[PDB]
Ligand binder design. Structure first.
Ligand SMILES: Nc1ncnc2c1ncn2[C@@H]1O[C@H](COP(=O)(O)OP(=O)(O)OP(=O)(O)O)[C@@H](O)[C@H]1O
Ligand SMILES: [Ca+2]
Ligand SMILES: [Ca+2]
Length: 1203
RNA sequence: CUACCC
RNA sequence: GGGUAG
């Protein structure tokens, strides 16, 4: 207690300065008003000077006009909550009508014209509130569109009005150009990349007018990009903006554009990581059913929320026990989750996207300075995002020496909540100190315990998903004979006992039905708990009247609507979302629960444009109803990819393309073109002359030309494609070639495998003198294997890796290949493998069928090269089921040696390095899987595994030749585990070749046979392989060359020399659309052609039908049309503010699916699920339908994008 | 169901 | 068979 706290508020609501900074400036003023504020005047600029270490990121932008005189601004702070308040506005605006009176176009002028006032806010707020930049533009006619407050633009035209100047200002605000025309270039900034890319190109070995033409062409695009001229006008992007003016009378002069916090940079701060350090300095001085509550900390930046959250961490660790960027502190009764919410806009991208919803936020306010002017925006953020309960806490209460003064700070927060319809009179307010609590002051540590004691009561217990009224999203439908109709999908909320009545609501009049039975895979239970994958039976209702996306809920719990209001976040350019904004008639599909549903929207009053990376309110009105209530996390699919997300906010009352064109295209799509002889050979020959290289003369040289390994990377890249492009051309006329040669090698695949299987059974050679290198690695391999593998494949990882998948089995064929035609049909087992199948029968109540039991598998031949074929082996369906099982555990486990099989990036990436480093060598064996003998497989594997590999393998096979064979090879190609085993075998050996030669085994990577190791180890590894059966492919193992290849990426001195093969006889336009495309990608860098190859491209582009030349799609979307600039495409229909394009699609007539097998497969998937920006967890797998490939070509419409 | 590939 | 984009 000092002087009276009465007229200290007189020093507040006459100034607005800090709480204690009044009384302390009043104690040094001797009970006077004036001279106290005269202190604050000078001792407030000192504080303003302290604001230099406060980096300002947020801000506003302001614009204003008079006649035809425009002006922009960039006055900015460091928080959203400030910029949106009625205070930063009163200042920012007032310094923008100061630029109207006088054309103040010099930042330094107005920066000082308001300095005595600029401090009057920071003393009242406490942020580095400083004006940044200002500029004005004059011209004939000038308009200005402003995006909310984040971006403002000024553009001056000539022949235009609000119908135009606003629209292109919307383009300046959207497409962000830096110049007006391709002419606006400093020759220095141009001859920068004209000289910097010359090296790029000339180093590769491109003649003058190649590299020059390419670079000029690329920079012609590079300049074209920033060119406001050549830039697809945002509103109608078919045409460039420069094209719009010429078509329009008009001609713009110039343009100004500001985005807040542009070039500000600085370093991003993460709340969660930091508090770990706030806690650390203070450190050194059963019941898992407890509810989860999402709390958040909201308040001033300098009021130390981050100090409080540390106290609520460490003091909560002193008693009971202690999305990223959130802490996870506990309490005796509950389990919390505590986020920091500093950005208004970057919290709506958390409530909406659901990355961090809210169950009740905590209101941190320093008691030394009371509530700040921007507190009414914090509290606003609460009652505008729908936070249930707000808990207030006075931080730093020791700085007040009078409780009569502290009581009066409550009057400034209790009434600040009453204005925002919060229980101000009945809200909890803890007066404490966090900094004191970080120390050991338990007198103050009771305050954190007082606050933490209020989350335990004031905040309501979250209705555990079990207790919420029943609901199950229908994910699929099956009509089983003897089961009526069953639907599946993980039940979202509630319990379903068998017999209870439910409602099927989705699109049709909501129908009602009783639950006959609820079941899983292994169990056929009776009650269905929430958050479990099940299948519920329905009586008196069949398949025809249950669509997907429908829900299966308790009657009268959830109603179907089609017109609601909602808020959505749009994914930015750097989030996969559309790198183009959209306007009024945006028509996407709203992916709800399981199904997708199209529909229109609208904008709330006054917004006309929304960009990628925005929050926005809207009124969604979809096509046909879906069952809903507020809180449905719905995403926003555009053509199968999601570009938005959102939550339904409140639900309301409820309520161009050329078809002829696609039919024209479809007709030409089926047009079979015709060529005088071999088209491919001509395309490839006429391509060789495009490169100076000598063309093929006969049809033999297509697969007998050996490329030289020297010259520029250009002298190689094309000389290499020559040798490779033809290789797989199956239709070779005078080819005396066969598929029988494939069998001839398969003979040696066992003949070699026999000679090794036999000889690899005598570890003692004759006596004890000699010591071989092969045996040595085997010994080491063997020990290495088992430390990584185990004694026997645990049934834990056995059952939950086995799966029915692929196509062909000895029982089935390519037609009956889907996983549903495996549960439906009786698949064949094998003598030893029976015991497993029986276990599966004992694993469930469903039917497990074995037709024959035989130890045979069909040996066939799949097309491979033009000089040879393959010899894959079709395995029995039950062996394959378990083979894929072990291959999944023997895969995941093979990741500890750093080998990733479902990511072959990490193997062609190291083929890159080796093409330069010359230390990494790529190795290819000759017949990988077929050369792996039973002998070697036996010596290495643990005998437990070596049995699980002997039970599941097919020991005998039957050829087309009638003749049978017993497999010397432990397993052939097509076998359900061989790929993993061969990877592990080779990797095992490769590592043993490393440690034996004093070298890192962790420098070894193996992808099947595509193995990569230290170059030194090569002659050892090669001699190891000579022993252990295998044989290296001199032609495809590279150790000393400038060239390396791996996982289908070839490299020459770090340059990309990946060729492309011409495969089947080119005939239908589909085959030529594709070929042109590969040659497009192989010869282009960002829409810029290699001129030489561009000739034969345009030349054979003529071969295609008329319409089938102007039909282009951006690369990455397939080969349904030629790849080109889609901005061009005539066919491209702009529907619903989204570009739609027609492309060639293989035509299919549907076939009836095995309802039995598909259902059994559907609940088998939901057993392998259970035992196994940040929101693709709103999506799931598709239902089962079979479609036979006809022969026709249909045309499907898809979604596309710019670049 | 369509490219690429071990 | 298997990876990987549609
Ligand atoms: N249809 C297939 N079924 C099973 N495995 C296959 C198939 N196609 C390729 N592979 C796998 O790719 C690996 C590498 O194949 P690669 O193309 O090197 O043929 P290779 O059989 O190893 O001998 P070659 O060098 O003579 O082709 C093989 O070990 C094999 O396991
Ligand atoms: Ca090989
Ligand atoms: Ca290989």
């Amino acid at each position: 207690a000092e002087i009276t706290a009465s007229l200290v508020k007189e020093l507040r609501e006459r100034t607005g300065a800090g709480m204690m900074d009044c009384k302390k400036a009043l104690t040094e003023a001797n009970g006077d008003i004036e001279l106290a504020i005269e202190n604050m005047r000078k001792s407030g600029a000192i504080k303003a000077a302290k604001k230099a270490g406060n980096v300002a990121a947020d801000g506003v932008i302001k614009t204003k006009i008079d006649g035809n005189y425009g002006i922009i601004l960039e006055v900015n702070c460091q928080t959203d909550f400030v910029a949106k308040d009625a205070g930063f506005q009163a200042f920012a605006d007032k310094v923008l009508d100061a630029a109207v009176a006088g054309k103040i176009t010099d930042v330094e002028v107005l920066k000082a014209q308001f300095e005595e006032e600029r401090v009057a806010l920071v003393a009242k707020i406490g942020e580095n509130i400083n004006i940044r930049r200002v500029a004005a533009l004059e011209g004939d006619v000038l308009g200005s569109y402003q995006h909310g407050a984040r971006i403002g633009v000024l553009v001056a035209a000539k022949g235009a009005d609000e119908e135009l100047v606003k629209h292109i200002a919307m383009h300046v605000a959207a497409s962000k150009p830096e110049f007006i025309k391709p002419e606006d270039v400093s020759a220095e900034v141009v001859e920068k990349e004209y000289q910097v890319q010359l090296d790029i190109a000339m180093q590769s070995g491109k003649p003058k007018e190649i590299a020059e033409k390419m670079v000029e062409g690329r920079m012609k695009k590079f300049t074209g990009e920033v060119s406001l001229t050549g830039q697809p006008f945002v509103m109608e992007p078919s045409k460039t903006v420069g094209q719009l003016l010429k078509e329009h009378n008009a001609e713009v002069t110039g343009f100004i554009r500001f985005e807040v916090g542009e070039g500000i940079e600085k370093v991003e701060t993460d709340f969660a990581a930091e508090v770990a350090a706030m806690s650390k300095q203070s450190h050194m001085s059963f019941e898992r059913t407890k509810p989860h509550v999402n709390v958040g900390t909201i308040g001033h930046v300098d009021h130390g929320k981050t100090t409080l959250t540390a106290a609520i961490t460490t003091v909560l660790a002193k008693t009971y026990g202690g999305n990223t960027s959130h802490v996870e502190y506990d309490t005796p009764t509950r389990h919390y989750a505590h986020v920091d919410c500093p950005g208004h806009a970057d919290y709506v991208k958390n409530m909406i996207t659901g990355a961090a919803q809210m169950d009740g936020a905590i209101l941190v306010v320093a008691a030394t300075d009371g509530p700040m002017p921007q507190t009414r925006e914090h509290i606003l953020l609460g009652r505008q995002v729908g936070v249930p309960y707000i808990i207030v806490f006075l931080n730093k209460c020791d700085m007040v020496d009078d409780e009569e003064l502290l009581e009066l700070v409550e009057m400034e927060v209790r009434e600040l909540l009453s204005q925002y319809d919060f229980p101000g009179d009945d809200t909890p307010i803890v007066r404490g100190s966090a900094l004191k609590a970080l120390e050991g002051d338990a007198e103050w540590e009771a305050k954190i315990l007082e606050l933490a004691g209020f989350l335990d009561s004031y905040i309501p217990e979250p209705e555990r998903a079990i207790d919420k009224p029943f609901l199950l999203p229908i994910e699929d439908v099956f009509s089983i004979s003897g089961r009526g109709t069953v639907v599946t999908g993980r039940v979202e909320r509630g319990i379903i006992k068998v017999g209870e009545e439910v409602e099927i609501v989705g699109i049709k009049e909501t129908q009602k039905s009783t639950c006959t039975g609820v079941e899983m895979f292994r169990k056929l239970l009776d009650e269905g708990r929430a958050g479990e994958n099940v299948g519920v039976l329905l009586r008196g209702i069949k398949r025809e009247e249950i669509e997907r996306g429908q829900v299966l809920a308790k009657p009268g719990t959830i109603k179907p609507h089609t017109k609601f209001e909602s808020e959505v976040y749009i994914l930015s350019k750097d989030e996969g979302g559309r790198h183009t904004p959209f306007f009024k008639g945006y028509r996407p599909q709203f992916y709800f629960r399981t199904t997708d549903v199209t529909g229109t929207i609208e904008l709330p009053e006054g917004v006309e444009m929304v960009m990628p990376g925005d929050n926005i309110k809207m009124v969604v009105t979809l096509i046909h109803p879906i069952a809903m209530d507020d809180g449905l996390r719905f995403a926003i699919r555009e053509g199968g990819r999601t570009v938005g997300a959102g939550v339904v906010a409140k639900v309301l009352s409820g309520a161009s393309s050329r078809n002829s064109l696609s039919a024209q295209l479809r007709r030409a799509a089926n047009t079979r073109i015709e060529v005088e002889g071999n088209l491919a050979l001509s395309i490839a020959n006429d391509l060789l002359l495009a490169y100076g290289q000598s063309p093929f003369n006969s049809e033999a040289e297509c697969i007998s030309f050996s490329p030289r390994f020297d010259g520029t990377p250009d002298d190689f890249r094309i000389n290499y494609l020559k040798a490779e492009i033809m290789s797989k051309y199956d239709d070779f006329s005078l080819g005396i070639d066969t598929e029988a040669v494939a069998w001839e090698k398969f003979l040696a695949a066992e003949a070699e495998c026999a000679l090794t299987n036999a000889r690899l059974y005598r570890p003692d050679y004759s006596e004890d003198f000699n010591f071989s290198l092969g045996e040595s690695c085997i010994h080491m391999a063997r020990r290495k294997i088992a430390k990584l593998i185990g004694d026997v494949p645990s049934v834990e990882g056995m059952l939950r890796h086995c799966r029915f998948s692929g196509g062909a089995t000895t029982t089935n064929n390519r037609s009956y290949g889907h996983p549903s035609f495996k549960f439906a049909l009786p698949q064949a087992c094998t003598p030893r493998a029976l015991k497993y199948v029986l276990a599966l029968r004992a694993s469930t109540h469903f039917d497990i069928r074995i037709s024959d039991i035989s130890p045979f598998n069909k040996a066939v031949t799949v097309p491979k090269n033009s000089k040879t074929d393959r010899c894959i082996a079709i395995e029995p369906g039950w062996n394959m089921f378990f083979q894929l099982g072990i291959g999944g555990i023997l895969r995941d486990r093979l990741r500890c040696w750093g080998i990733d099989l479902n990511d072959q990036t990490i193997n062609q990436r190291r083929a890159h390095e080796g093409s330069v480093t010359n230390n990494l060598a790529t190795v290819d064996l000759s017949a990988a899987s077929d050369s792996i003998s039973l002998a070697l497989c036996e010596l290495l594997l643990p005998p437990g595994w070596f049995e699980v590999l002997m039970d599941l393998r097919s020991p005998k096979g039957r050829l087309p030749d009638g003749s049978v064979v017993t497999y010397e090879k432990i397993s052939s190609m097509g076998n359900g585990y061989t790929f993993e085993l061969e990877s592990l075998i080779f990797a095992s050996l490769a590592r043993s070749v490393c440690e034996i030669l004093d070298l890192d085994s962790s420098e070894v990577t193996v992808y099947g046979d595509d193995i990569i190791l230290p170059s030194c180890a090569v002659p050892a590894l090669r001699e190891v392989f000579k022993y252990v059966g295998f044989t290296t492919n001199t032609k495809k193992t590279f150790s000393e060359g400038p060239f390396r290849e791996s996982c289908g990426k070839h490299y020459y001195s770090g340059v990309d020399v990946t060729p492309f093969y011409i495969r089947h006889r080119i005939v239908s336009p589909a085959d030529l659309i594709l070929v042109l495309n590969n040659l497009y990608r192989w010869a282009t860098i960002d829409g810029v052609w290699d001129p030489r190859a561009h000739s034969v491209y345009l030349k054979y582009r003529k071969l295609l039908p008329k319409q089938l030349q102007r039909n282009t799609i951006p690369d990455g979307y397939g080969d349904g049309a030629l790849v080109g600039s889609v901005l061009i495409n005539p066919f491209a229909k702009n529907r619903g503010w989204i570009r739609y394009v027609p492309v060639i699609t293989d035509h299919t007539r549907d076939r009836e699916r095995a309802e039995l097998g598909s259902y059994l497969y559907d609940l088998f998937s939901r057993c392998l699920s259970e035992s196994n920006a940040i929101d693709q967890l709103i999506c799931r797998s598709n239902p089962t339908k079979i479609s036979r490939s006809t022969g026709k070509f249909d045309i499907q419409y898809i979604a596309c994008s710019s670049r």
